[PDB]
Amino acid sequence: HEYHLMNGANGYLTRVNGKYVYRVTKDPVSAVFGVISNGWGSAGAGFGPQH
Amino acid sequence: MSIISIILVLIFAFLAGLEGILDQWQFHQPIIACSLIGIATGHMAAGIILGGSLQMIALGWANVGAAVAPDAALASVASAILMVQGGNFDLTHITGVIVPAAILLATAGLVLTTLVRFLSVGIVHLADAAAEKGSYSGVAGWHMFALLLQGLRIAIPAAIILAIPAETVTAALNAIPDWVSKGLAVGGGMVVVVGYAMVINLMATKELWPFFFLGFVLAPLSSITLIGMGILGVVIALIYLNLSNTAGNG
Amino acid sequence: MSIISIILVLIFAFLAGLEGILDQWQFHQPIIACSLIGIATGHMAAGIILGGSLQMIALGWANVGAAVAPDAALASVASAILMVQGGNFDLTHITGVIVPAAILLATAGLVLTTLVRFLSVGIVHLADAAAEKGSYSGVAGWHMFALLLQGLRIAIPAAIILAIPAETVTAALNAIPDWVSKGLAVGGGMVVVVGYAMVINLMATKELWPFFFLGFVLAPLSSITLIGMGILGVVIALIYLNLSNTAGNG
Amino acid sequence: MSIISIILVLIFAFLAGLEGILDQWQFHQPIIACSLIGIATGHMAAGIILGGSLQMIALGWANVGAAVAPDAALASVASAILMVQGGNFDLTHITGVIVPAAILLATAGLVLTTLVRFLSVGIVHLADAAAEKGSYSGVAGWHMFALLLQGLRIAIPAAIILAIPAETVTAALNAIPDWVSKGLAVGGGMVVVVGYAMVINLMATKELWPFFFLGFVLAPLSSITLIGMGILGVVIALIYLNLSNTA
Amino acid sequence: KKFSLSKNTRLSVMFRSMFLQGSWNYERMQNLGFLYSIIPALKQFYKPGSEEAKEALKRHMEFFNTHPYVAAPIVGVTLALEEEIANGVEIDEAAIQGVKVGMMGPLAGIGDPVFWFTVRPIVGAIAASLATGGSIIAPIFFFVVWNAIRIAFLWYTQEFGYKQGTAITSDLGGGMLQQITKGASILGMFILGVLIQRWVNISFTGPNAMLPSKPLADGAYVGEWIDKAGKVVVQGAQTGTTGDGVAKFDWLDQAGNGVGNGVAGQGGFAHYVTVDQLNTVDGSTLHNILGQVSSGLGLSPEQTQSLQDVFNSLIPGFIALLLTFLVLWILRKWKNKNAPLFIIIGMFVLGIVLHVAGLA
Amino acid sequence: KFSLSKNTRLSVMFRSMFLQGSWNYERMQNLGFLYSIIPALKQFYKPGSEEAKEALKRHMEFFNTHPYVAAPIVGVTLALEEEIANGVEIDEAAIQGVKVGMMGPLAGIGDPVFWFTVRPIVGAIAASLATGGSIIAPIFFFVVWNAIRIAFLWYTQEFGYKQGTAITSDLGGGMLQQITKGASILGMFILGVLIQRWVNISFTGPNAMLPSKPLADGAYVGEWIDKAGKVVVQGAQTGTTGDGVAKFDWLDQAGNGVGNGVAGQGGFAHYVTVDQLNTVDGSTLHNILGQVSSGLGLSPEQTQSLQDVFNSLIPGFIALLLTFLVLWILRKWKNKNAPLFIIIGMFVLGIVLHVAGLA
Amino acid sequence: KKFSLSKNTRLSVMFRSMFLQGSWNYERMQNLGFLYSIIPALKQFYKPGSEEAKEALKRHMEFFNTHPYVAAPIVGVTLALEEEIANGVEIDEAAIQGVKVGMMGPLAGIGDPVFWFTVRPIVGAIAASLATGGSIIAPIFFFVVWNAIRIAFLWYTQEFGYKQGTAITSDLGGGMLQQITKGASILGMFILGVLIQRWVNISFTGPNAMLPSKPLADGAYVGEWIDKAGKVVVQGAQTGTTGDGVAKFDWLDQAGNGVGNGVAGQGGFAHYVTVDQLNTVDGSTLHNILGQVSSGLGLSPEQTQSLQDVFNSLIPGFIALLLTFLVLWILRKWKNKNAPLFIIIGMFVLGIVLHVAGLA
Ligand SMILES: OC[C@H]1O[C@H](O)[C@@H](O)[C@@H](O)[C@@H]1O
């Protein structure tokens, strides 16, 4: 519920006290499917002249 | 440590710096980079486990369309160097302390690689000036010089971590206040607008703006996933193309 | 009921009755007229609620082709004043005993403005009589007098419905049957359809009927707000326009 | 079971056999026939439930050009009689055993109605022989004789399946292993795919293919009901036709 | 070429043309409104009381009917015409009247649906939607958007008219305005469909108009299992259905232990009940209830369906569509100038009728 | 003379609704047409007459046509019979000439829109309404389909009767192709919607549950238990110890401060789920409901099944794959009884998927 | 003919295209990698210092950005083109440039998800799952699998781009590209709109930017009635408002009986409270509480409308659209070179300011 400063392919990175911590919240297969979905959705973007 | 070990680590970091941008043999990816640095410095399991637990984060960290990547190369190299410097590999110090340091140093490598690739414009301009004379040697040499500078971008900021000690880096990264941390967080939560800005600017017409607004209006429907919206865009394009080509035939 | 409140509502209703003819800033529309009257006279949340409720009924009430509109100005102003005179804002009587009163006073305002505009031919005759000597000051003064009469048309009844004792009005408004109140409420929850009917009657073609059903079936999506649906309609119309134009050219 | 249920299901099967080829009132379709057997033989809700469940399978089951359809009539009637004989309607047993039994009965009805329509080639010959006498009564009588015969083609199996005692059929249904029953319940959501693919294959063009994916993409919006979705499809159709014709 | 108006004069002319209505006449539509709009140009052209000023003023006692919002183009072109007439040019006197007469018809015909019937519904609907939440943003929003649109249009087209002259006739011509008319009509129909679906609520709950309530099931509604004297159990594996027709079910408490192992339903060990009579809910029972309600399971032990539920299952706003089509036919056939009023009162009576009868 | 009224038109209507029933394999739908036409012939010629015999032999030939779209033919035949019964010199084969050359296009139109477009849509809508076991659905299907059929037949019978032989000119070509294309578009769009909506093989199962991570210490719904019961809330930080842990403030739900211990096992207070809470009554229940309404997982360890992740990709992914596979094998097999084989094979696929625990 | 580069030369070209990146610039992206890749063929074609050489080398100093893996087809195609020019085949530089630009974009768009987002996630997941056991199998597995796939793709697609050469130029010039580009642009614009709405979170909650909270109502929020000491009461039928200014509300216990029968609010027997205060909350009280919350009824006694809530009620993603249009205008208004980097640093500073000010 706390702030997600940086979110990797699995888990996030909050502050917590003074010592930075990373928490993983996704199973590797679920993370792979999530990045698959994000990549395929963004694949619609681009496709243009790109100068 | 051992002189041969130090030379091996520096050369391995140079290769990782090369392939953080070359991105072909995946030398820079954490799964191989951390494991191979562990190969050089004795203990194998530390490097293997660090690479394995960092590859999970590193998925989808590929720079696309000039949207610079979080630069997993320096993250892997610096995290491995810190891990070997501190004699603790209980798989709890690896995840608790080393991984967040790797992420922060990944952001640092992001800014470093952005700086170096911005600097690369000068060498590519010198390369154009040399190729004006039409010498393969000059352009090849300038390309190699740019590549070796990019490799040095991680070669040099690795011995610094390997030399100073083992506790100043972790404490220094942990001493960052919430001020700049949350400021950079909210900045990165909106930075993608700029990245999409040039894409929208390059392709744009009064004929195509309606599709942009249509997508923006239809997006808040949370029941459709991103791939669903992609298929919807594809079918909308197909329908519009069919309707235009029907008149094109006539 | 502070004397400042009386002067505020008096000038405010005078402006609203003015807007029944000029109609640029739309001070007379219920969404603003009733809301601002409630702002002047104490409680406002019920005032803005009633203004929003009556705005949809005010839809399709634009005078066209010398056919005078139901004149939502007097309806809105008198309904708001009658509401503020009654210490009862349970959101039920507002749709129960105020909206039908709003319709009745809308007919009253229509019959008032018909006579006012019919007699304005006399003041225009005087205006051209004063123009026969060649001075802009006279015709400007007669224009101002005509607008003053138009505003007073609403100004006087707004004062007469305020000077009445509050005890009599609170006894009268509470003397209605409860069942008739709820019946009028549930009926007024449906009257808005009539407001759109003429509009649909005004614009209707075999080419355009499908859009009505498209919007009707797409509307249940609560995740799209009214502004989003406005943009959606604009883009749909634009796309159809380019397709038809390029089909004609094609 | 009172005799009123018995003769009600008998007459309902009779009309089902009528529209097995009449196909006018659609009393033979599962949504109608199974529901009707639901009201007739007591338990009514389960009839509607499995009528809806089997209707998905029943789409694309129309006969065109002497290609006899899988005969949803006998399948629906027999499955309804089976459920009203088998006191289990948990929507798992409904989709587990009754649906594949209905499909097998559909194939059986296909072959039986092919036999009946083959037999009709004789009765039509007697019909035209009587027509050679110039009597309207003769031809009308032959026509309703053929209609009555195909009415029996579904009435008789209904009576036969009703003849068996309830204990035997309920024990036979209770002898199905649990695992296969739940596996068939899982696969019940699969057998509609082939029926849909039939209609998809009947009409398809590289010009029209995108609309299938458009409907597939827009369907997940649970706030638009089936009739709303159909209205959306219709308006899309007229928009496309209006834009295509004006070129 | 003297007698050239300044920018502040243009702004003042626009502000007074804002006051175009006011002299509403059934014999001469907005006769002196145009005169008031063009007053200061002639004020700075010639002093009142002279023959030139008298004629210039007198030239505006003709019929002048147009949409009030789209009147800046006419003001600009007329000011431009009078500038040349006042600068020693032989422009015909009646040319201005003729161009005005030509301009009233089509311009009003195209501005009538666009402004009163296309954009005003949009702005009013958005304002009402914002106000439904009891927020102060709605009226100020309506004011600012409407005034911004009107001011921008008025000023920009007044400048265009003054800078162009009579060439706006060729600028518009024929065919161009048809595109705006078609687009505005399409947008209006779409938004009207949306509004008809959204803002017509005839919810048919009532005391009547309720279908009989089904008893639902034995676990398809939010509840727990009670075994006589307190405690909560959970159904387990099947030990084999009895020959009578009932199946013996395992009962497991919130510990993993199995006790009783009776037949579910009344006569057995435990029976399914709703949370209404539950006592001392503290423990994992609250967690189970939260999980069940997060699973979408219904709370009422009996499923009560109303007529509005049936219509919603068909399609939301179905009766709204029926009502609007019936009303559309009514004003398509009745053909009375007063007919909408009578429709309103009659359907108010009908609204009373459903409430008393129990449907609404 | 010999002019037909509207009562005989309703009679030929109700006798044309039995167009099928006398169906054969070499001369199909032959006697149904005669059963429809007979009352007009009875009004025209008495039974047993030679003219009646010739007219009976006239309609005895081959006539195959989609049943619903047959009222135009019935009306045209009625008009032609009326014309021939009053001594006009039309050829006796003109009826066969108009019939033979037109059943093709009419059948080709009638099959897709009626069998493959209207019926699937109406049946699917009825079944969707019937999924709850409500009597509304069969009534809706019955009423709408019968009304459509009756209105179509009544309108078309007079469309053919009043016009006569000009129907061929009225139909012509191209105009019917528009209806064909529209019906195909609508039908296959609805087919896609049904593919997404009514193919459910959810992969929850006992297996196919990916391993669950212990997650975190406050990212799920729960409260801070403090040794001997009670519920507390984290406060501020009093300074991180040299070991690596920090001491916080354990504020009671009254505004006070107590305990001041570390969190986790040996500490004074630690996070715990709602399962183990005692005397949960009070503001704790409000906090719990607020937390769950915030969109917080109930279980301490999040569990994802293959169905959830598949939906995360796109809903109905397996349905699209199955439909494409079935279409390909239908196009390739090119058999007669293939559909039954595919159906039983899909049953075997379902049972093997369930026995494996995936679904 | 001559200048037929052998298989060894093509293999050297591929081993040099190994280094397509490395000279990564921001203004001329990936431009020198192409020249480095084609250096061997160009060297075999012309000697250094030749004017024809000079032109050939200067030709390939233009923009070329794509996925490095899907560039071997392009490399082979342009190698075929170069050997066509070497023998004197009439093809202008514009043809080669158009060939390059034709699939510079679409091939990148198709290769980005299939390699960065499809193959790499799977290979990395398998490698990590193998490495979690502390075995050297995983890094060698990742290396071998990825390099084998990449090398096979590079070589075979490079050869497929060598053979079937000018035919692909004919396909490009056959009018297909005029359709591919339009379709890609439409799809890209649609997805860009979707991403602007979705992937831009400017959440404005903060500790500031909270509009004042209103007392709400007397039942629009969760909670029950507390009468004096203990017990929970439900409002009953209204019997009328007394003349002093208070209305008596029927009171019912949570059992179906009637007690109290008085007024509501402080002075009455029972007053409204939230769930925080009352204890010993019974099962029926829970049933009504979840009935209320499941109905969407409000939760906090004092609802707080954040600025983000107002913006969402206006339209979701409003701030995202405003920022997109602002940066579009900034890029349109030429603020010298290096504008994107200045925009990035300015927006990061803006985010810092927003967070420290308490807005975001
Ligand atoms: O897609 C464009 C392309 O640009 C660069 O070459 C790299 O960042 C690639 O990863 C990216 O795919």
Ligand SMILES: OC[C@H]1O[C@H](O)[C@@H](O)[C@@H](O)[C@@H]1O
């Ligand atoms: O266009 C004519 C014009 O006449 C009057 O001024 C008003 O009714 C306007 O609404 C209308 O547009």
Ligand SMILES: OC[C@H]1O[C@H](O)[C@@H](O)[C@@H](O)[C@@H]1O
């Ligand atoms: O057009 C085909 C049509 O004619 C056939 O003879 C009959 O089987 C009908 O059921 C079918 O629909």
